Amino acid sequence: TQFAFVFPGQGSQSVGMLAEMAANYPIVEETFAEASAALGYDLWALTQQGPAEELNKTWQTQPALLTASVALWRVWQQQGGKMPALMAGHSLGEYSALVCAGVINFADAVRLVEMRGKFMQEAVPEGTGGMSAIIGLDDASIAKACEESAEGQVVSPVNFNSPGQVVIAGHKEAVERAGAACKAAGAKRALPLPVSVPSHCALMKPAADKLAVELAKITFSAPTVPVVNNVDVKCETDAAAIRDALVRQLYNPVQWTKSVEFIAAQGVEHLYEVGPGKVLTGLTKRIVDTLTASALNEPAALSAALTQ
């Protein structure tokens, strides 16, 4: 086919997410019921009632996001939707893609990402880390501002979301210094994210070590749909290969801009965002303007996408 499926991560959750899709297809709440049975609490109720402060806790956000994406995948299949040529995910999103591609058992994945969130949250002492979105400054300048600002601490470009949108992370003070340096180098803005965990940088090392232990116990099967990982920007099929990329993903940058450039290089013409929100959808044209993108979280939109 001429489309790929892309899966979003932290930031795309919202209270009330998938409410209309759930009204359209009972399989949405059934999928969440399966996750809820593995988690020991009503995941659907949490996404619908919140409060946002709870849904935003990473060990709850991750299963909520994975489940939401798997639910849309199941709706797509139920209605006869064809298989994408390739899949890709943004951090947590990679797990969604791996579940949809048949590599990891859904309940296993739900338990896995819950732990992933817990490990990440404990990596560093409360309030010592930070992430900031740098807007309107080239990758070279951002890297230079980070090097100048590190002063022995950690601060690196960690999410390459698009040209003009790079999230940096590390020790909070280093991130505050790097943001200011980025602005002085021409950045339009430096916007701290609402997360307290410095994802995708060296400080996640301990979390990655614990995750690798838990991942080693989960049976990885052969993918029935190809998945390009965001840490190396390539497709792996060997379980050990997929695992190690997941381990390394946690403390290495998400090369989203390169992953989308790679998808376009394969000849894919359209990206469908399989999850809540329209985050990935928005980045697409900024990365490769020959692509089109749309989200699959609204009933009318999913209905239209099937018809072609």
UniProtKB/Swiss-Prot annotation:
EC number: 2.3.1.39
Catalytic activity reported: holo-[ACP] + malonyl-CoA = malonyl-[ACP] + CoA
Pathway it works in: Lipid metabolism; fatty acid biosynthesis
Protein keywords: Acyltransferase, Fatty acid biosynthesis, Fatty acid metabolism, Lipid biosynthesis, Lipid metabolism, Transferase
Gene3D superfamilies attached to this UniProt entry: Malonyl-CoA ACP transacylase, ACP-binding, Malonyl-Coenzyme A Acyl Carrier Protein, domain 2
Domain of life: Bacteria
Enzyme class, first EC level, given as a word: transferase
GO biological process: fatty acid biosynthetic process
GO CC terms, sorted: cytosol
GO molecular function: [acyl-carrier-protein] S-malonyltransferase activity
Active site: 91, 200
Disulfide partners: none
Any single Pfam family the record assigns to this protein: Acyl_transf_1
Family the UniProt entry places it in: Belongs to the FabD family.
NCBIfam families: fabD
The protein's name: Malonyl CoA-acyl carrier protein transacylase
Native source organism of the sequence: Salmonella typhimurium (strain LT2 / SGSC1412 / ATCC 700720)
